[model samples]
Target: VLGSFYSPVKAGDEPASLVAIKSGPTTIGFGCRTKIDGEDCLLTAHHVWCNSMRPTGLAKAGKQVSVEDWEISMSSSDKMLDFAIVRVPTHVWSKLGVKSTPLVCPSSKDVITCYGGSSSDCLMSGVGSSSTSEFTWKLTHTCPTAAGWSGTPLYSSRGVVGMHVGFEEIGKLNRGVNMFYVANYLLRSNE
Candidate 1:
């Protein structure tokens, strides 16, 4: 919402869903959030908190913060992808209370990415004003997307399809890009 986590901006139908995952200072991103799973269970990005348990993967280095009360959750992420879903601790949720209804995970039967701009297909969402290098991004929203929106959800005809990966300049056109890798990868992991 505001940054990688904390500080809510504004929520609407465009599906600007926030997620929580264990992370460190460097792992902060725009569209992601943090949540508690067990004793201080926090979720951000596998990359953000990469192997901080002095272990392997993303949460390997850094001070782990134990959450208070939280119940929010997001899609599942594998070790390879920069995403993850950490259950919000009960205490944190009790304190802050529920902000929005549970985000319906994209139906597994039909995963599709959709909507953002003039076309009914794309949707509108925002990211933090800061990022890894810049602390935050400048213009949060424009049309299809702006910088710092990595991991932003993609709503397709079936449901929540994928996430905004980044952007690229093609010929004379600049475009917003995304990846369904996380969803598909997670699906495979489950299988």
Candidate 2:
């Protein structure tokens, strides 16, 4: 699958609920998105948001609005899970646009599925560099990902089915696993 690094908007309405972490005057690569809630909610690795203790805050997802301009809320987090949810304020519903219906997760019984993204495509783009050098970012019959290519969407025939996060990147050994958090995870677990 391929993933796009989500290019920032130069001069227009940006994403409705994407966040950009800021440290002093510089913008960091780390960011999160608010959930379907109208509150300042987002999800990210505990390590990314929280140092040792849990971290929660409002963040801007797109350029049109300041998503982090509200109270950021979190559901839960862990290293193994590598995900967290942030909530937004009730008053900022129209500005942030967190009022959309929740995205339904794919059925668990789905056995045949494929996810595609704009990230570093697999093959010539995955192994090393490509000789074609035409697109220089397309992949072949292989996996497409990198260490910084996490939290990207994986599209399926049924539309956006899930998101994949790249775990690691060894020297010359593109041996990293693409972790997926299906929409079902947001549903009630049959316990």
User: Top TM-score: which candidate number?
Assistant: 2
RMSD (Cα, Å) of model 1: 12.5
RMSD of 2: 10.4
What is the model-wide C-alpha lDDT for candidate 1?
Answer: 0.31
The models' CA-based lDDT, in order, is 0.31, 0.32
Q: In candidate 1, which residue ranges exceed 4 Å CA deviation? A: 1-16, 19-27, 30-45, 51-80, 93-143, 156-158, 168-191
- Distance from true location, Cα of 23 in model 2, Å: 3.3
TM-score of each: 0.35, 0.43
Report how far off residue 10 is in candidate 1 (Å).
4.6
